[PDB]
């Protein structure tokens, strides 16, 4: 019961970290970020430590999560993931298809905190479930 929850929760958090990574790389280069079709595809084994062609990929909890989202059509934008269901962290609604870099009150920065605020409770649960096994 507990052990299985930790596995799914951790996979979901992993997808969030992949997203944070993309955003951070955008903030570093002073670039905007697209989270629609012109952004990355999150259905990519290499993003989660799998070699292309590794049959283990389709059995991963990462793939199980992504491939069962309402917004999944063989592929998944960052927006599809954030706004898709079912996941433990619910759905982020009303997102823009892209966030441009600005010098004042950077949209990419506000997007970053929107995402991290959403993943924080997930991370807390993972820490806390991990914390009652050692």
């Amino acid at each position: 019961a507990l052990l299985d929850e930790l596995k799914a929760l951790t996979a979901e958090l992993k997808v969030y970290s992949v997203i944070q990574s993309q955003i951070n790389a955008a903030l570093s280069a002073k670039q905007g970020i697209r989270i629609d079709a012109g952004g990355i595809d999150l259905v990519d084994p290499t993003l989660y430590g799998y070699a292309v062609g590794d049959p283990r990929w389709k059995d991963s909890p990462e793939y199980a999560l992504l491939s069962n989202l309402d917004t999944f059509s063989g592929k998944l934008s960052i927006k599809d993931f954030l706004s898709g269901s079912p996941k433990q962290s619910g759905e982020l609604k009303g997102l823009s298809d892209e966030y441009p870099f600005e010098k004042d009150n950077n949209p990419v920065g506000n997007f970053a905190t929107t995402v991290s605020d959403r993943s924080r409770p997930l991370n807390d649960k993972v820490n806390e479930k991990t914390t009652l096994l050692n």
Partner: antibody
Framework: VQLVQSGAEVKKPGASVKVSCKAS????????MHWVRQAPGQGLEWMGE????????NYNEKFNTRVTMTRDTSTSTVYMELSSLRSEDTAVYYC??????????????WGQGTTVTVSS | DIQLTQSPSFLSASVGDRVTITCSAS?????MEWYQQKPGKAPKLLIY???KLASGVPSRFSGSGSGTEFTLTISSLQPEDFATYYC?????????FGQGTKLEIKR
């Protein structure tokens, strides 16, 4: 949203056809565009898809060596070209905006269709 | 490929009848979509994500199911519902359609 396709065509076997689909009313480069066809008296078949932001495509293996999808972002138009035509390719061809778009907006959109007739 | 097999292929009913059309997939799929089609017209989306109603579609239509078995139900058929219905999955390449269910009026 409107998807406006080019007019009906007639082709000889071995030739190729190029159908256009002009898109409006949504962020063109934000969603994949699909093609679906339907032969007379028959059902529907998905042909493939193209990502208009980057020109990436995925085709139904059945058409993979004969079909070419391209787009022009400046004019919000997608093209489907089908080569080495045979009579079995006689069909109505539709460009379609669906998939994840429907989750966001609660509807999909299809072009009016283009009839292509292949015959000697 | 995921093959979608609809049953029945042909169905007769009367205005006012409640009817159910089934779509069986050859392997499990996360969601099903449903289309209506009339002669000389493009397919019309009715139900998406298995059970959601497309904008403006009458509450007469509903969808359900999971795994390999999905259903489209019309409660109290109106004259305009006699048409061909297709299920469709866009989750697994290549995207595939059912062979269609044609609904005619009893007489």
């Amino acid at each position: 949203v409107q998807l406006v396709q080019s007019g009906a065509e007639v082709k000889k076997p071995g030739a190729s056809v190029k159908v256009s689909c002009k898109a409006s009313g949504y962020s063109f480069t934000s969603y994949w565009m699909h093609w679906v066809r339907q032969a007379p008296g028959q059902g529907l078949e998905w042909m493939g898809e193209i990502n208009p932001s980057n020109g990436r495509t995925n085709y139904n293996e059945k058409f993979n060596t004969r079909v070419t999808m391209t787009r022009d972002t400046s004019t919000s138009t997608v093209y489907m070209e089908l080569s080495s035509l045979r009579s079995e390719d006689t069909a109505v061809y539709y460009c379609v905006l669906y998939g994840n778009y429907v989750v966001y907006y609660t509807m999909d959109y299809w072009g009016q269709g283009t009839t292509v007739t292949v015959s000697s | 490929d995921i093959q979608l097999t609809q049953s029945p292929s042909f169905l007769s009913a009367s205005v006012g009848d409640r009817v159910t059309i089934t779509c069986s997939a050859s392997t499990s799929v996360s969601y099903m979509e449903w289309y209506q089609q009339k002669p000389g017209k493009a397919p019309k989306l009715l139900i998406y994500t298995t059970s959601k109603l497309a904008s403006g579609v009458p509450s007469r239509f509903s969808g359900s199911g999971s795994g390999t078995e999905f259903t489209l139900t019309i409660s109290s058929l109106q004259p305009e519902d006699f048409a061909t219905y297709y299920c469709h999955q866009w989750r697994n390449y290549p995207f595939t359609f059912g062979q269609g269910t044609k609904l005619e009026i009893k007489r």
